[PDB]
Scaffold this active site. Sequence first.
Site, PDB file in Angstrom:
ATOM      1  N   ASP A  31      44.620  61.085 -83.660  1.00 40.32           N
ATOM      2  CA  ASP A  31      43.186  60.953 -83.388  1.00 40.32           C
ATOM      3  C   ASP A  31      42.644  59.529 -83.431  1.00 40.32           C
ATOM      4  OD1 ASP A  31      42.804  63.792 -83.151  1.00 40.32           O
ATOM      5  OD2 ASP A  31      42.833  63.915 -85.343  1.00 40.32           O
ATOM      6  N   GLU A  85      30.468  66.763 -85.904  1.00 43.45           N
ATOM      7  CA  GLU A  85      30.502  66.843 -84.438  1.00 43.45           C
ATOM      8  C   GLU A  85      29.323  67.585 -83.818  1.00 43.45           C
ATOM      9  OE1 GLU A  85      34.405  68.622 -84.079  1.00 43.45           O
ATOM     10  OE2 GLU A  85      35.430  66.693 -84.178  1.00 43.45           O
ATOM     11  N   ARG A 124      29.470  71.687 -86.507  1.00 41.52           N
ATOM     12  CA  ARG A 124      30.682  72.351 -86.971  1.00 41.52           C
ATOM     13  C   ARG A 124      30.776  72.228 -88.490  1.00 41.52           C
ATOM     14  NH1 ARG A 124      36.633  69.898 -85.183  1.00 41.52           N
ATOM     15  NH2 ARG A 124      37.852  70.488 -87.039  1.00 41.52           N
ATOM     16  N   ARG A 164      42.237  77.577 -79.981  1.00 39.66           N
ATOM     17  CA  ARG A 164      41.349  77.011 -78.981  1.00 39.66           C
ATOM     18  C   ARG A 164      41.752  77.466 -77.587  1.00 39.66           C
ATOM     19  NH1 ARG A 164      41.007  70.894 -81.685  1.00 39.66           N
ATOM     20  NH2 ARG A 164      39.685  71.561 -83.443  1.00 39.66           N
ATOM     21  N   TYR A 213      37.124  71.328 -77.386  1.00 37.70           N
ATOM     22  CA  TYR A 213      35.749  70.973 -77.726  1.00 37.70           C
ATOM     23  C   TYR A 213      34.771  71.387 -76.625  1.00 37.70           C
ATOM     24  CZ  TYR A 213      36.966  68.177 -81.855  1.00 37.70           C
ATOM     25  OH  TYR A 213      37.391  67.754 -83.100  1.00 37.70           O
TER      26      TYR A 213
END
Lengths: 388, 388, 388, 388
Positions: free
Chosen positions: D70, D197, D212, D290, D324
């Site tokens: 990340d 976020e 979140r 996800r 996302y």
Amino acid sequence: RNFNNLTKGLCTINSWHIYGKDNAVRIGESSDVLVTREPYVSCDPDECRFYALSQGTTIRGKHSNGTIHDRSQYRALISWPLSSPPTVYNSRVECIGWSSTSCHDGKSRMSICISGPNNNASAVVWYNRRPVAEINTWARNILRTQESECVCHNGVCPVVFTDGSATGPADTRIYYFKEGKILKWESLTGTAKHIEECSCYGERTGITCTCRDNWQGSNRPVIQIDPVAMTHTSQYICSPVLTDNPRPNDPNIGKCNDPYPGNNNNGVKGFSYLDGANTWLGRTISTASRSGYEMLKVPNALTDDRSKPIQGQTIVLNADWSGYSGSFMDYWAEGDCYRACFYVELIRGRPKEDKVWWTSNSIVSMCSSTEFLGQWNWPDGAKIEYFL
Amino acid sequence: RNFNNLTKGLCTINSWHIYGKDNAVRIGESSDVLVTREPYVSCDPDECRFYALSQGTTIRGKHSNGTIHDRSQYRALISWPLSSPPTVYNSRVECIGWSSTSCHDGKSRMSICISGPNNNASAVVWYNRRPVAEINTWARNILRTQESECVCHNGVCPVVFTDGSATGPADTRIYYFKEGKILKWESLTGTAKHIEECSCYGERTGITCTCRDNWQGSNRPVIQIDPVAMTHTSQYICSPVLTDNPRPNDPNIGKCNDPYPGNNNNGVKGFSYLDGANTWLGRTISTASRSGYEMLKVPNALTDDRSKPIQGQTIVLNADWSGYSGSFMDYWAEGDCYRACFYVELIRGRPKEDKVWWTSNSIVSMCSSTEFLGQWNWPDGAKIEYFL
Amino acid sequence: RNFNNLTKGLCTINSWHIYGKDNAVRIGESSDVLVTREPYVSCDPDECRFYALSQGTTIRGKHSNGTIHDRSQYRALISWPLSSPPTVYNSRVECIGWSSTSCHDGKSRMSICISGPNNNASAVVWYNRRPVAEINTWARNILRTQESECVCHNGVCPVVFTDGSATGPADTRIYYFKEGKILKWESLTGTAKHIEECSCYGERTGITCTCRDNWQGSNRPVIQIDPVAMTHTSQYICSPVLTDNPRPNDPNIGKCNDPYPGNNNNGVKGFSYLDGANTWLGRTISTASRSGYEMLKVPNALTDDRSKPIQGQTIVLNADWSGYSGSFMDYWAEGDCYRACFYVELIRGRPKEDKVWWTSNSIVSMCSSTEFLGQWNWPDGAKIEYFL
Amino acid sequence: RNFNNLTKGLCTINSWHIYGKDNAVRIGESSDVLVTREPYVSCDPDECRFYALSQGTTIRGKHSNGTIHDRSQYRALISWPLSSPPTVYNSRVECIGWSSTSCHDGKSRMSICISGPNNNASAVVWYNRRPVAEINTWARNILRTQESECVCHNGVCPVVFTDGSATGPADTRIYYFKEGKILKWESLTGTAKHIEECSCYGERTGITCTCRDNWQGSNRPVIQIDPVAMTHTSQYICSPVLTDNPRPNDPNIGKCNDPYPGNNNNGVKGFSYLDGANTWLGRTISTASRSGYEMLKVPNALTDDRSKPIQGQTIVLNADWSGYSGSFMDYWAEGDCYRACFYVELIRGRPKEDKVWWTSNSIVSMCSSTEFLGQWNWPDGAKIEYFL
Ligand SMILES: *[C@@H]1O[C@H](CO)[C@@H](O[C@@H]2O[C@H](CO)[C@@H](O[C@@H]3O[C@H](CO[C@H]4O[C@H](CO[C@H]5O[C@H](CO)[C@@H](O)[C@H](O)[C@@H]5O)[C@@H](O)[C@H](O[C@H]5O[C@H](CO)[C@@H](O)[C@H](O)[C@@H]5O)[C@@H]4O)[C@@H](O)[C@H](O[C@H]4O[C@H](CO)[C@@H](O)[C@H](O)[C@@H]4O[C@H]4O[C@H](CO)[C@@H](O)[C@H](O)[C@@H]4O[C@H]4O[C@H](CO)[C@@H](O)[C@H](O)[C@@H]4O)[C@@H]3O)[C@H](O)[C@H]2NC(C)=O)[C@H](O)[C@H]1NC(C)=O
Ligand SMILES: *[C@@H]1O[C@H](CO)[C@@H](O[C@@H]2O[C@H](CO)[C@@H](O[C@@H]3O[C@H](CO[C@H]4O[C@H](CO[C@H]5O[C@H](CO)[C@@H](O)[C@H](O)[C@@H]5O)[C@@H](O)[C@H](O[C@H]5O[C@H](CO)[C@@H](O)[C@H](O)[C@@H]5O)[C@@H]4O)[C@@H](O)[C@H](O[C@H]4O[C@H](CO)[C@@H](O)[C@H](O)[C@@H]4O[C@H]4O[C@H](CO)[C@@H](O)[C@H](O)[C@@H]4O[C@H]4O[C@H](CO)[C@@H](O)[C@H](O)[C@@H]4O)[C@@H]3O)[C@H](O)[C@H]2NC(C)=O)[C@H](O)[C@H]1NC(C)=O
Ligand SMILES: *[C@@H]1O[C@H](CO)[C@@H](O[C@@H]2O[C@H](CO)[C@@H](O[C@@H]3O[C@H](CO[C@H]4O[C@H](CO[C@H]5O[C@H](CO)[C@@H](O)[C@H](O)[C@@H]5O)[C@@H](O)[C@H](O[C@H]5O[C@H](CO)[C@@H](O)[C@H](O)[C@@H]5O)[C@@H]4O)[C@@H](O)[C@H](O[C@H]4O[C@H](CO)[C@@H](O)[C@H](O)[C@@H]4O[C@H]4O[C@H](CO)[C@@H](O)[C@H](O)[C@@H]4O[C@H]4O[C@H](CO)[C@@H](O)[C@H](O)[C@@H]4O)[C@@H]3O)[C@H](O)[C@H]2NC(C)=O)[C@H](O)[C@H]1NC(C)=O
Ligand SMILES: *[C@@H]1O[C@H](CO)[C@@H](O[C@@H]2O[C@H](CO)[C@@H](O[C@@H]3O[C@H](CO[C@H]4O[C@H](CO[C@H]5O[C@H](CO)[C@@H](O)[C@H](O)[C@@H]5O)[C@@H](O)[C@H](O[C@H]5O[C@H](CO)[C@@H](O)[C@H](O)[C@@H]5O)[C@@H]4O)[C@@H](O)[C@H](O[C@H]4O[C@H](CO)[C@@H](O)[C@H](O)[C@@H]4O[C@H]4O[C@H](CO)[C@@H](O)[C@H](O)[C@@H]4O[C@H]4O[C@H](CO)[C@@H](O)[C@H](O)[C@@H]4O)[C@@H]3O)[C@H](O)[C@H]2NC(C)=O)[C@H](O)[C@H]1NC(C)=O
Ligand SMILES: *[C@@H]1O[C@H](CO)[C@@H](O)[C@H](O)[C@H]1NC(C)=O
Ligand SMILES: *[C@@H]1O[C@H](CO)[C@@H](O)[C@H](O)[C@H]1NC(C)=O
Ligand SMILES: *[C@@H]1O[C@H](CO)[C@@H](O)[C@H](O)[C@H]1NC(C)=O
Ligand SMILES: *[C@@H]1O[C@H](CO)[C@@H](O)[C@H](O)[C@H]1NC(C)=O
Ligand SMILES: *[C@@H]1O[C@H](CO)[C@@H](O)[C@H](O)[C@H]1NC(C)=O
Ligand SMILES: [Ca+2]
Ligand SMILES: [Ca+2]
Ligand SMILES: [Ca+2]
Ligand SMILES: [Ca+2]
């Protein structure tokens, strides 16, 4: 600024001159050129651009495999500078979908993209690069539109849509937009029996669209639109010079108000300029397949069921692959008349060249001259063997 | 805005400084650089750009094979930012064809492209990025034009064309355009016996073009044009400093009104600045082939049949390949005089380097300085072996 | 518009924040990124851009072999958008040559490029993208200039040049330009004994340049220029915090008016901000090679020969390669002070990493904050093994 | 120009239409497309663009190995034209770092990028493309922000930040910026127990952010901001239609003022539009991973702890990878209401597809229609096997 008004007649067409050509497949052999199909050309007041439906992959990319397929979630209407190829780095996405039209009204551009599954498609109407209105499928069978530019008068931009069977009666509608808003729509009237992929142009008399009868006809249906009253009529080109593909051989009597028979359930997008003695028709040279392209001067083709050619010009040799063709004009040019223009899609790959696994095209485009110019022929120019 | 007027004389030329260089072949070894030939440079009021005829393929692309060929349907006049290379992604297509010229008149740019088969070619004249006028072949033998910029005065832009034999008498015409429209044309007059590929520049005296006699002469013909009266004269550079290629060795008496003999049926595009004691001539260093390039200060070269050099500058070593060369100036620069500029085409590949199957070029360009600057030499810089 | 005037002081520097980073070598492993070296950053009133000397080839291109070489005909000053890498398709050529500087005066940009062989080099001064003035070598030994931005006040833009030996006394000149024209030049005066590669910035007091003594010194010479009177002085940074590379270890007494000895005939371009108690010096972490980079707050470093650091910030770890560094500021930013900025060249390839045959770099850049921000370190980030 | 004011309500949402899709991974298989993650969309008054955090390498580049990571020095916020992919040649760097937000206030754009090591990160606030203010870490544990657009009213642009643990209580702050300057900040108040976020939108009532809870909750926390008073409240979406991922199955009673339990220490960025009977919630279809994406019309979801869906639309099939998602609107569109829009990140590669060594994504985006449009599904579309 101000909305454009259609205040001029067509220039006298005595021959056709080269306007644009992108050599996209030649260049795409060794550059990041997007796979496309269903191209066209459309002008803004300060620029003219090439348009097409991308397939969301480059030609050399592995995702080019299977691009004979017409409808996917990876397609989009893109535009790019005149005669450049459609590259990853120079292509501007106008909207997302697998059927489109686009036109500038003098102030801003309207672009329309249809997406969705066959039974649940929808059109999104963009104006000045923003989504403005949406239209849901009315027949639940591949809502679809022109695949070339629309035309505007005093802000009103008519667009022809079809939803329903490709091989029988379908539900065709003419929509009238202004600044992306729906002013009005009408069901198709007149004697045209099936309508696909209309190619349109405008002049002082009104807007003229030459379409594709995919059902029974190999003559082309014509829709004539009055953008002020927002009304229309329809019929077929009366001439026995038949211009769909595939098609029967030319008879000596055409059909004004019904399909000319012999070929069913197929066709190609095409165009014409219908202007009395200044009438020119485009068609493939082959009666069997999408190969070759020629222009023929056929006086009063729209109304005279005996009319034949008195002049012509070869654009693409029969030996070379063609494809869709359509009309556009630079409505913002200087002078006292509108110069007729057209493009021809030059399809490469599947189904005709199946040694590669992709289908794409390049573009060639011409505009009319008042001179009687010498003719050349304009092939795509790529060698398929290079892609193997 | 306003049309540019030629109101200044040439700046005093005491040496030449580097202006631009694109290193196109070096970069094209590993980038999407279009194959080109016949380059030039031309300025707009706010920008100067490189121009050339693309071949519709990149150098590393498989379609680069066979690009020694001069005329095809895949060629186009492109322009791109000064000293960048001509890439797929940065090149702007001006028009389609295989012979061109282009110039800005102060308001908009005119570009002219010729296309067609040898016996049926036609010129399309574009102005402000739109097609305006067309000219059909008059001799049915490769209608062709300058391959470098034209020049304008008060909106009038003369252009030299030739149609007919490359190896005997041909039909040369001078056309006078304004906003793309044909004001007038004239057949060639004067003592020049054959005209190709004129390189032109303008100043207060009028427009001067230095051309190529492809028939019998190795001295260069000159056309002098009055863009106000729209008339012209022609002769040859009188100087015994011969500047075509290939060519005989320099004699001590040149020829003003006839070809200087020894070499037939060949030549190269070239240029000069003819300005009394401020006269400079360009030429290849080799008398046999397109290799090397030098500038020579030859006082009164135009009119003095005994004139020799009194100063010079090497631009490209004889060991390095050159090619076409031509004149341009920034007519919109600040100051009291026009600074003479030129480019040299640096041809790589066939026929001289036949281990590769392509022909392309890069560009180097210089402008004059009133200083006496040190000289370097400016090779293309690419290693052919890298392309094997 | 109006010429910029230097009317503000420096902002208080309490730490440095990330400004830009292009990751050029990482990206160039798989993209058409030009080989460069000698980068810098310079702002226009509406945009800030990265600058560097291209080598006229991409990194993956075969012509990248041999790019450790400093001077060739294939080099040019290019600029490109802040933090993008210098690609074939996004790089704008400012001028042709192998040593440069560039600065905007508030109205237009001046760019200067030097080219030629070692004994016959010349500078061409461009203004508003046109060549305006030229300067011939005065010592016939590699005429050369700053390799970072110049600075302007009320239209006057001073530039430091050197011509002559790199390993002994040379001929340094300060030129004063306006709109590209030479207003004046002066020979170097003061106690600096050798000058290379000046890094300059401006504020209300005048223009300050921190240079490289390549001859005997490992302290940095400083030239202070009054752009109104067009005069200058010179000395060295007095501080015993030595900032050239390679260099001796830091003593406790520096040298104000002579080279600090120990290392001869080498150096690196560097910079400082000399502003009393707000003084910060940049240097490599290593005393032996171009590795690491740090900023040190050294009060009154210019004038105090005993001055030491009281605060610092690591920019690049000693384990990572650095290179040239220089100053620039956004003179067109909002606020009451000029925010000090700098870049560090991160050199990859030869001579330190000789498994590849090329030499290139990427850029990292910082500007000052009035906050006391946490520090990171900023490596080039590419893995050499990927290029093998 | 003038600062934008939030003066309209949301348009009535009766379905969602396709807005944009870049097909980045498909195209990146054979083009220079940057590896990205954490994308979003944001409009200027004259253009809407895609945004994301680059990883400073292309997908086919060898440096794509390890891009599941990340935070690195090679990341940057980039923007590029709507529906184009993020390429090396078309991406504009907004700032350097690994967490971002960005928004236009009507006059200029503010962009915020955070960089640094975990224990020493800092935010730099850019306005009108220049750095203006900086904020140091306050909890020394990964200072981080929205990863989608902020929203402005009369020049005031609130932004939500978090610093501290991702798996327990952390220090969340709401900052209020104007022209990049810090007007005010506040510590988080209200009943939301953990914030990450935030996805925000504005309308006449104020600014609404859906965030979140990474700690204990699988319902989403909501922050409601008054940008005039510069104050805020917080709670959770009351509805038992749970919208974080992973998450428990939907109960019949939700939680307004505390986390709904069952899943700890994980989550995904998401969004909602909370507007009484016009309320729509986004979520992944899967409760475990996800994958998939759907919109559900849940009347009064914010305040009604019994609320269930009465209408919905599938955006991405459960069989396809998502990621996302966040909110944005075109605040500069014509009309009497703001049209709700959102994007979904379509993550490809690691950890779910570990045959490749990279992690990237493409983008799909929708906006609301007042029509009841047919639905399609919108997969990334790339075949992983092609990358092997
Ligand atoms: C340099 O460039 C220039 C400029 O481009 C070149 O000049 C061009 O040359 C081309 C090729 O010849 C011409 O195109 C053809 O035009 C003719 C039409 O013109 C002819 O006929 C006119 C009409 O005549 C009738 O009425 C007059 C009234 O007075 C009457 O007198 C006459 O007896 C008859 O009743 C004539 O007016 C015209 O004469 C004029 O022009 C002459 C020069 O062309 C000149 O010499 C004369 O002095 C006079 O000025 C001329 O005779 C088109 O008919 C033709 O198109 C047909 O043929 C092509 C194949 O070549 C085909 O592809 C077309 O589709 C079409 O034929 C099909 O359709 C017909 C209609 O149904 C059908 O009848 C045919 O059997 C055929 O059908 C079959 O094929 C199709 C397609 O596959 C299929 O669908 C069907 O089912 C079936 O299988 C050409 O378009 C240009 O007009 C001409 N341009 C100019 C300005 O001159 C020049 O050649 C170049 N130079 C060099 C050295 O290369
Ligand atoms: C740093 O950079 C600087 C700046 O670039 C360099 O300085 C430059 O150096 C170059 C190379 O030497 C010079 O170019 C040459 O210039 C001469 C002309 O100048 C000479 O002659 C002048 C005329 O003299 C005549 O009139 C005067 C009147 O008073 C009279 O006195 C004299 O006796 C004679 O009657 C002289 O005025 C001039 O002197 C001046 O300048 C001198 C410096 O140059 C200086 O020392 C003096 O004090 C004075 O100030 C000088 O003597 C050109 O003739 C020459 O071009 C010929 O030669 C080259 C090969 O080098 C060739 O390529 C050319 O094509 C040409 O020769 C061909 O054509 C001729 C014409 O027909 C023919 O006669 C030749 O036989 C030959 O023909 C053959 O080859 C061609 C081509 O392949 C073929 O087509 C034919 O068929 C045949 O096979 C050069 O251009 C620059 O002028 C000079 N610049 C400056 C500002 O000084 C400096 O060297 C660099 N420094 C370093 C260290 O490198
Ligand atoms: C989160 O981020 C923050 C922000 O970045 C991090 O905080 C930063 O931490 C770094 C690293 O420690 C600091 O950089 C160093 O700064 C010192 C200077 O500050 C120290 O000394 C000051 C001066 O003291 C003197 O005067 C005072 C007057 O009162 C007197 O009291 C004192 O006794 C002495 O006489 C002190 O004022 C200062 O204290 C203050 O700050 C402290 C925090 O730093 C704080 O705790 C205190 O309370 C107070 O507020 C502090 O003590 C620099 O000296 C140092 O630079 C030297 O060392 C590095 C290696 O670390 C080296 O690379 C440098 O080149 C340099 O050392 C070389 O040069 C010297 C000068 O000639 C020489 O003497 C050395 O021997 C050495 O020379 C050798 O190496 C070089 C290079 O290779 C070679 O050329 C030579 O030949 C030779 O071989 C650092 O720059 C930041 O200032 C600090 N920032 C802030 C805002 O706090 C934080 O750590 C991060 N958090 C985490 C968890 O990571
Ligand atoms: C062409 O395109 C069009 C337009 O897109 C297509 O039409 C669309 O079709 C889709 C798919 O069917 C619809 O989406 C679903 O909508 C329903 C909600 O509508 C239904 O229920 C409404 C509420 O009913 C309640 O109140 C009324 C009040 O009167 C009462 O009468 C009724 O008895 C009940 O008490 C009804 O009002 C509504 O009827 C209306 O619309 C009908 C058409 O849809 C029409 O026929 C009627 O005449 C009337 O007009 C209708 O019955 C959503 O419930 C549903 O979402 C659930 O199901 C999907 C799976 O399909 C799932 O992914 C969702 O997450 C959700 O289910 C989960 O969550 C629930 C809430 O907690 C839970 O209860 C479920 O058990 C389930 O939970 C499980 O899965 C989740 C997710 O993995 C997990 O998190 C949980 O833990 C657990 O494991 C769909 O969104 C569109 O609304 C509809 N659009 C339109 C405009 O019609 C058309 O089909 C296309 N045509 C073709 C040919 O393809
Ligand atoms: C077109 O006609 C309308 C209606 O009269 C007029 O308002 C408009 O200005 C016209 N457009 C142009 C370009 O003049
Ligand atoms: C050039 O001369 C014409 C004719 O007098 C004049 O109208 C025009 O303004 C001039 N152009 C410029 C740039 O002044
Ligand atoms: C800088 O100072 C000069 C001289 O007084 C003045 O004319 C000019 O307008 C100033 N520049 C600006 C940006 O105000
Ligand atoms: C927004 O409101 C402010 C404060 O009244 C006003 O000054 C500004 O002009 C408004 N913005 C617009 C776009 O009208
Ligand atoms: C990616 O990097 C890892 C090292 O962490 C290595 O094991 C793996 O082989 C690499 N993949 C490729 C394609 O080189
Ligand atoms: Ca048919
Ligand atoms: Ca000759
Ligand atoms: Ca030194
Ligand atoms: Ca959670």
